DNA sequence: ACTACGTAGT
DNA sequence: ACTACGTAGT
């Protein structure tokens, strides 16, 4: 379990499955979108997301990122998302300013965008009355860029 | 989709992954137990199968192996297995007397393990009144002994 | 749409 | 036990 930069893999390779991910260390879960492990303390914080088309995540071209929390039934009937586990160490990572590893899901499945900070989050009541969380992330200067 | 051996893939080879069987040819569906494909006419033949834990399969270590048909929700409420598809493909096999690949799962993950003809198939009622299929294969003589 | 002898992590 | 932004094939 590292956080930030993982060595021999950089900003633009392309992986066809999540168990490469896995095998690299980039990305931990088999499904799950977010990756995270204790800190110097015991608290959550988040090492990797994984965009995919999953959940009305929002990404333009730009260097930010809105990026969908998990469960809720969301992308069984709709239910609030808890802030425990993947959604609490996003929310966690913004105050650590820890790096986290973004990868994004292409329509040659996978590529890695680089590194992260969460800014902040907040919480949206959908369409259903439900609670839906929301974290922005930067993509942090200096780093290749990827054409889209 | 190949019949038989699979170049550069020996007896007694070992894989982590069912997504390894599929990238090298060996066994294709992600999950499925039963591997198959037309043949000259409209009919399904088998061309590989992975016993690794579901279903009761009979495994010494012998040349003899019965395999349990899939479905039924054997290995929802229990229902009667089906003679289609793969279940289908296994018993055609038996007289179109091909090769089908043989994958054990093993307790990095799975080995291969040779070629087996089908000999027969059966039906069991099962402790539920509902109906399960039985193939026995048998090794094709002349390939490499496994250890177990 | 739907079946599937998958997987990792907590 | 149970959650999960997986997968391939038909």
């Given at each position: 379990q590292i956080i930030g930069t993982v060595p021999?893999?950089?900003?633009?390779d392309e992986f066809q499955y999540r168990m490469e991910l896995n095998l690299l260390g980039?990305?931990?879960?088999?499904?799950?979108?977010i990756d995270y492990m204790k800190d110097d303390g015991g608290e959550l914080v988040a090492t990797s997301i994984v965009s995919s088309g999953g959940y009305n995540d929002v990404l333009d071209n730009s260097d930010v990122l809105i990026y969908t929390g998990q469960?809720?039934?969301?992308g069984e009937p709709p239910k609030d998302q808890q802030l425990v586990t993947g959604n609490l160490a996003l929310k966690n990572s913004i105050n650590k300013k820890n790096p986290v590893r973004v990868i994004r899901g292409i329509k040659k499945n996978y590529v890695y965008d680089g590194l992260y900070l969460v800014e902040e989050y907040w919480e949206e009541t959908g369409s259903h009355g439900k609670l839906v969380f929301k974290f922005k992330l930067r993509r942090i200067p200096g780093q290749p860029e990827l054409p889209w």
């Open positions: 021999g893999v950089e900003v633009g980039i990305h931990r879960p088999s499904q799950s979108g469960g809720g039934n969301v």
